[PDB]
Amino acid sequence: RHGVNRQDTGPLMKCSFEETVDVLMEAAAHGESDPMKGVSENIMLGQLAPAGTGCFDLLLDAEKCKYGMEI
Amino acid sequence: FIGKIPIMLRSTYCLLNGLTDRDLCELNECPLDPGGYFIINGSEKVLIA
Amino acid sequence: PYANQPTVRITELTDENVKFIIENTDLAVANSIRRVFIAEVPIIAIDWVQIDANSSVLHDEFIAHRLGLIPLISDDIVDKLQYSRDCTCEEFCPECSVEFTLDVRCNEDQTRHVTSRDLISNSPRVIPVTSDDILIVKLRKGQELRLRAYAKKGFGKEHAKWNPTAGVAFEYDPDNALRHTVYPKPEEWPKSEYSELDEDESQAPYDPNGKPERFYYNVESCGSLRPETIVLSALSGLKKKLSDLQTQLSHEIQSDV
Amino acid sequence: MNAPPAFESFLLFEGEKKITINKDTKVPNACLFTINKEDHTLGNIIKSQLLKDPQVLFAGYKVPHPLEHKIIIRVQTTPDYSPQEAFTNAITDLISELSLLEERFRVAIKDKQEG
Amino acid sequence: QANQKRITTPYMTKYERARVLGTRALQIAMCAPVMVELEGETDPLLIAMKELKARKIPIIIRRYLPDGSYEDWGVDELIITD
Amino acid sequence: MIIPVRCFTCGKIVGNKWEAYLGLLQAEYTEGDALDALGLKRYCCRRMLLAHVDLIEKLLNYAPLEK
Amino acid sequence: MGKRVDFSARTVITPDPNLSIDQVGVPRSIAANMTFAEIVTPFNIDRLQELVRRGNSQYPGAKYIIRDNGDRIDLRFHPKPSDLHLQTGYKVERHMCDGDIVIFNRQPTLHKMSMMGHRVRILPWSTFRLNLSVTTPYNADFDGDEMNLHLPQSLETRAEIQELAMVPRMIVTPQSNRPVMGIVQDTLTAVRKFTKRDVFLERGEVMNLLMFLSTWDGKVPQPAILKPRPLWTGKQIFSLIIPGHINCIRTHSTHPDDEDSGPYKHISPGDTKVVVENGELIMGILCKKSLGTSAGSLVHISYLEMGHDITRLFYSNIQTVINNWLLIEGHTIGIGDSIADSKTYQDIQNTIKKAKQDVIEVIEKAHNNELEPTPGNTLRQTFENQVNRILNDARDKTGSSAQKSLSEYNNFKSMVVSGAKGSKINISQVIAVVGQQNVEGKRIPFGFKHRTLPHFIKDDYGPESRGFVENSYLAGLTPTEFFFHAMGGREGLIDTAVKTAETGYIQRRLIKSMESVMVKYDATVRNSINQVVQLRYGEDGLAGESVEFQNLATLK
Amino acid sequence: SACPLRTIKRVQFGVLSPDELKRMSVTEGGIKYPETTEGGRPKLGGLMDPRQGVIERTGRCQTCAGNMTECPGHFGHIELAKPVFHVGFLVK
Amino acid sequence: RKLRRQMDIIVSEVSMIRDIREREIRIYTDAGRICRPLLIVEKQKLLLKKRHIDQLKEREYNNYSWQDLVASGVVEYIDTLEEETVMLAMTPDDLQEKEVAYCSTYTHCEIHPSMILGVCASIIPFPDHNQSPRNTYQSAMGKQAMGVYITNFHVRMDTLAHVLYYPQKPLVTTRSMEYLRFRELPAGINSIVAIASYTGYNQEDSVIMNRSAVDRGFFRSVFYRSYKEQESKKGFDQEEVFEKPTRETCQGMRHAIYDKLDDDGLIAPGVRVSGDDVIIGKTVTLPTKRDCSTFLRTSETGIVDQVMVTLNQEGYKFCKIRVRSVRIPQIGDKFASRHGQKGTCGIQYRQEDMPFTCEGITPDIIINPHAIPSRMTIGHLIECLQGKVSANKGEIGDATPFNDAVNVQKISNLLSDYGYHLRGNEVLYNGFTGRKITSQIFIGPTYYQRLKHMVDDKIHSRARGPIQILNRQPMEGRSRDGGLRFGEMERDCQIAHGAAQFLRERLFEASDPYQVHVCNLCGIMAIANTRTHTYECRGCRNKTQISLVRMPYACKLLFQELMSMSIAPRMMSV
Amino acid sequence: MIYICGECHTENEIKSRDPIRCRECGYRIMYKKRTKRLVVFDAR
Amino acid sequence: DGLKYSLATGNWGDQKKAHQARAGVSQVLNRLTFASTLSHLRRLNSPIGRDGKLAKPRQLHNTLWGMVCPAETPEGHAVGLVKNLALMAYISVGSQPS
DNA sequence: TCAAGTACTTACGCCTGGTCAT
RNA sequence: AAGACCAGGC
Ligand SMILES: [Zn+2]
Ligand SMILES: [Zn+2]
Ligand SMILES: [Zn+2]
Ligand SMILES: [Zn+2]
Ligand SMILES: [Zn+2]
């Protein structure tokens, strides 16, 4: 906890390791903001973590769709 | 009367003390049962040293 | 590409055991005949048990399992009987089953041994191997056992109750000539009952040109079938399986071509 | 709770063919026989009989899974000799051997009893 | 970023491959037109696989660089390991 | 509990040999001799009677539920 | 950070050598309970209609129908015909079937190979069945062990597991750039017995073995021996299992250290070493050094050259064909493997007696102040050093004597040289001497006043009083030796029961320290705050799965 | 479900001011009664407040369509007679 | 010491310790001191003479017992701190005799060194030939073996009672099993066990069982489950009555079948009950009726054995229903010998498929040879050898630990006298092909145990069932149809896989999926009336800019708990 | 509804809302008198 | 009620003081096997915490010879802590030293 | 500035079941 | 209805 909770990471990442309520009280008192860039933070809020298969984004190519069969 | 002390089975103050195997089977009690436990609300409890 | 001509030499023939030697046949044929002795020889045994009263210290399925393991004399009517699956009747009928009745109550202070002798069959020929007696359950005074049981036709593949034989002794190459087993110390192995070598030598010299033949058998019947009838039924059943497979293969060849 | 019935090893249920004949495309004059509700008793004896045929190049059997009840017999033969013909010949051979064995065993039983 | 000056692996990553395959299989299972000619293929996962082998999946992979920039790579522009 | 029928390994009838085994033990025979007298040759059959404990006799000391 | 999940199954695991590496045996009840929602298309509308018709009762059926409105028609309770209508867009929750992708886990999940994706194979009875080469990644054995079955519920997560977490894709770990799976147990022992020169196979035996080779081209190879009778060799058949054209060189466990220097370097008089050229086992006897989970092994080369799909077939074919050959040869353990010769027993006893006399002499020197303390050690410390040296040398000598007495038919030696199970110390303890029993790295402490047990006199520093078991397991331990062995094994039991918590805490601390550290799209390793932990991963930008041990040949 | 679906890109922490708690609170005047029910029905201003959530699992919230599953629960408040130190914030 | 030996003033419990170096004599009479009897050695001779043994041999009808032995000054109870000052001889005929002198001042002798073991460790044959962890494992496993746990199990209404069909006393026994009453109540069957590699299904720790033997009753068992239920009078008019409910008289009702109940709402014994069937029918009067009936544990499929009706302490109706189920050993059940060799049943082969000797013997159990070398249970092998000797001879083998008269060579020589290879190896034939196995197999009767752990009691499958009231996540436990926990280690493993979507499924979709409406200005959840579509944020007067956010229900609960602690976890979508 | 007493093993008939007490013995533990409907047991 | 509660729940002490009361005493007798019943009736407990990682109290002390079984120990978090009596082991019942 | 106290925390993974008293 | 404890499994 002394070293992982000292990193300038989000309060939600710290609250997942050994302090929880204390980290969140410190964040509330100081108005700390969680940029939601980590894995634990996104897992807590049920969002696709920026891990593999989540670190990129998929787009539909409309030009490439102009070659479809049974439309 | 001041209370009821749970009685360890097959002890001196148990009803199975001194009973023969025939007497024990007459009460549907196993002669090979060593006793040494208490019956609290049907459950058999054993005190660990 | 044709059939070898096997020969049989029977050495011992009792009411419990048949010891015979089959010569000039494949090891696979002999082992299949041995497997059919255990697996595919039809035999009548109790499979349907219904209990009216059971006050004994053994629960209902205990005594049912014990009843199913009681051998029944199925010497001739096993072939006449049909599998209950192949029978047109619903439930059970005399052409597919043999009914049994048990009614024992202990009234005396002496213990009552319920035996296979207390099994009563509707057929005079299917008897629980009682021309001692197999113990079903022991009854204290006041304990009763009444049940009805039907005996079905089956073989040992479905259940061991339909295994017509005790331990089937099988052996080939008594003196180790083919070296199908290698002894790290041959001198410390007892010589076989069928060994033909002297006390001085432990195993026969290796025969590179040899193949497994002259298979030694000792089929011990459990009394349900005569031990000679076990081998006859096994050969007939193996041939029946081969004939059915041939019929279906011929149909498949005609259909696909 | 997942116990298969004991008759599931020999009984053919609805729509299950006893034997299925499929050609093997890797090798010429080779076929694969799938026997349903059959085990080593027939497979080993058929494999052994097929090896007696000089025109059978390959003869083998296996059970893909012991918890399932199926035999795969792979038979390869010489040109101008179908593997199905070899299989039929092997089965007829086995039946002929079994009939002779049964007759000789009955004669031996008769000789042993009062003789 | 534009098509020129893309500084990223020309190879499709295994994570990109997995997500593209799953997304395209879901699209096919939801009645999306199949870009490749299928020969008795009814499993959307397998159709997505054969589109991937044919470089026909109409998906652009947007790769976000840690400085906030992104590069749009079409699936056909990436070289598949398989 | 009770003497099993059909010895587990081979399948020989051993359920009819418990009382005879007890009698042979009670009169003269040693256990090895008594097993031979009953024809129990294979040790799979011998262990059926040699290792058998007849708890059903102890179970008969309890009165039945119905008189 | 963790929670209970739907679509999960747990049951005991039992072996199945007839399953593939990526296959898992699943009981019918579990598959009839777990359901996968499948979107109906004109491609699968008829199949899903049949599944709906079968309902929840018949196993290859369905449990629910989800319409476009989101309303769920239950198919478990006599549904009404109109609610069984499947138009494109509906989701029918069909029962889990063969080939379904599932996540297989055995807690604790130490690494990512401890939770891999498998392929469902429905089998009778009620246990999960997994191939024995998958036992090593999970750290599993089949004594009451239970595993978890997580079934992905979407096509996207199904593809994720298929393309990332499949067992063949997890063969080589990035942890040590070695395989996590190898040929183990009966298959390894029978491979060792099958790869010797003496193994000559008949025609029918070869055909039966080839029937269990899935990658067989159908051509029976010409035998090594043509006359006087055709005989194929075990290496000849195994060369048909080796995928593609794999070039590999290994050594057997019993390889002498003089062969490479002297003659017969390329002839291998004991048939040791291992050479596989062009996917053909030219020479050598295989063991855990060739088919095990180690760097540069034959399976490792198969993965690095052929790929996961063919390596899976390699594993499965080895398992099947070698088990079916072992059906002929067989393997056992008995008293005869625990018994040595009379001369070996006498030699062991002479060694033990000499060691006890040496300890008595050291004790006499210490009692007469003739023991000069080694620098850096006290008098008691140097005395204990000398006594432990004598006893360890005695146990090593007795173990060597016991090992040299084993014949080639000995089964302890058979499972040791193959690497399947056991070691030379086990053979030594079974046959020669159990050895010294230590508590906290020292001889058995004086629990009583200046004596280990009441049966000894005070200040008894001899081997017997302090826990040296002169007897072997075959011989049996004396009561003092029995109690001292119990004291020694108690320490191992305590360590086993206490290590798990501390190691798990360390692992959790590490994972919380580095959970968000990943390789970015510019190949820089960064944390959640985009701080550059490493400019390139491993300082070289490579994954740990593909790298191999190599020599510079220009250094030194 | 007319509101657009959104992902949380940032979580801002802070201390709920008493004014914000009172504005947010669904009970008016605070929780004055410690009783849950008085006549078999949940009393307004008590611990079990129908404005605060769904009860009986088949009824509906007083502030929204509850269904016992769609209702996320609503906050109430207690106006303390005198200020009280916060244990979590006491060191601060 | 003389007084304690004569039992004049000092009772045998009292311990007397003389610390000679410290000049202290400590006498203890208090309770709790652990002591054991030891024979007394005066000079170099035991005080236990032949006359004491002769008198004890006639212990019946002689009134001569252990107390007479203690009162005669032959044996003495010594506790640990007095055992500090004692000089003990392990065996008399070895350590008190004159030899190369080690000790001549022996003051006590062990009665027998096998008495160091407890109840469960005394059932181990040849424990001194096993590794100590294996002895510990067997000591743990013996309490889990199934037999006849008590003779009056018929009258006992015990939850989770297991009784074995055919318990057998071991062919190889310890001299202490007589005093442990193990012969009377044994847990296990002497099984013909082949330590062999047959088809790979006994690999790792698994075992291969004979299906034909299992059919013949081998290791068959019965499972007894007792259900307790009690009528009660709690409310003024609320009461519980045992009765058979009708279709519409009870408010609550299950889709189960109540036709098996009697007029008293209790199923009679002999009625075959499957899963979900109602054991006891009970109704609760609601201040018409509410169903409180009890159902079977899922998939038990047993038959009602005994139903008991009585009155409890309060005098209310009290019922105990015992349901019996016969459990044939499957391929998931757990078996172990008395040497720590535990394992499940890999597969079952019938008699024809099992390997067979020249005499037709087929092993009941096949265990892998790989379980022996690392685990070093040589006592297992010696037990098998001695059991093979004893079954053929007709005696019961003696496996008391430290005998010095029962060697492996003696057992081998005895086995060689019955036509068998002295080391226990026997030539086996492949069941499938009939061919000899090249290696000869070690076969003999080894005592095996059937453990309480069975696959049917451990098999569970979850697919979207019950959820917890607070967390809205799947329930916990196989009995509650619960879902398996995807813990933090599993999450880390899936992070290492880079499977973000599967991780989201397990931690968001498979478990509780939820939606909330948060304000856009503040990050606090807003009142959302979906039917009326009136979304309002109390605190901003925000009715227009309110967003929909999908989050796990546990996360909403966490945020509400943080708000309960005055923390504002404002979820910002901008 | 016939119950079998556990002490004197006699059959007594009692109805609902009747305390359990065997006649002529005064014992409060009874048994259910196994049903008449027959259940088939496979002798397997 | 005090006796019945302390024997039933096992918390040795007053019900209101259950936390200060030692728990785990008076287990439910194990009827799985007769050997299990005997082992439960002859069983000793070390009151120290199971979560404690100290290995010394868990070790097999030399003084346990003939007093406590060297082999029967709860494998797991109670290794060395829960112990069982030897066959000949006896525990003094107490006497007045008058 | 310091440094020596003293208060104060914090370590088990998954799984089963049973019993007990609110 | 879900907590406490206990026992156990790997
Ligand atoms: Zn009919
Ligand atoms: Zn037998
Ligand atoms: Zn609401
Ligand atoms: Zn707002
Ligand atoms: Zn009465």
Side-chain angles (χ1 to χ4, degrees), chain H residues 61 63-64 71 74:
Chain H
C61 184
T63 75
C64 55
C71 183
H74 312 277

Side-chain angles (χ1 to χ4, degrees), chain H residues 1-6 9-16 20 23 25 60 63 65 68-69 71-72 75 86, chain I residues 472 514 517 524 527-528 530-531 535 538-539 546-548 556 560 563 565-568 570-573:
Chain H
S1 181
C3 299
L5 181 62
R6 295 284 175 82
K9 301 176 180 58
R10 185 180 70 92
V11 171
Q12 175 62 51
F13 285 91
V15 180
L16 286 168
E20 183 173 22
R23 282 188 269 102
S25 172
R60 299 302 176 91
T63 75
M68 188 66 175
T69 307
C71 183
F75 264 79
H86 196 291
Chain I
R472 264 181 171 82
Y514 200 69
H517 296 72
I524 306 183
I527 285 85
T530 298
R531 274 132 50 92
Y535 312 97
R538 310 272 291 276
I546 297 185
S547 296
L548 182 66
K556 181 196 75 63
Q560 291 191 330
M563 296 170 58
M565 300 193 302
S566 297
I567 299 180
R570 305 184 187 272
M571 305 154 56
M572 309 303 298
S573 166

Side-chain angles (χ1 to χ4, degrees), chain A:
Chain A
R1 52 184 189 274
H2 320 119
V4 173
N5 294 24
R6 267 53 175 179
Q7 296 177 319
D8 50 331
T9 52
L12 289 188
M13 202 285 291
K14 306 176 181 182
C15 90
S16 58
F17 177 61
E18 281 187 21
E19 285 193 13
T20 72
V21 54
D22 201 331
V23 163
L24 298 175
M25 290 291 181
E26 292 291 334
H30 297 288
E32 292 181 0
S33 179
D34 187 20
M36 274 290 162
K37 308 300 296 180
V39 180
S40 290
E41 309 85 312
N42 289 271
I43 280 173
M44 293 170 62
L45 270 71
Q47 302 173 3
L48 201 66
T53 70
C55 62
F56 58 93
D57 206 354
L58 294 188
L59 300 174
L60 195 71
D61 206 341
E63 296 324 289
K64 241 110 273 102
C65 284
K66 274 128 213 175
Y67 301 101
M69 268 61 137
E70 205 131 315
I71 145 110

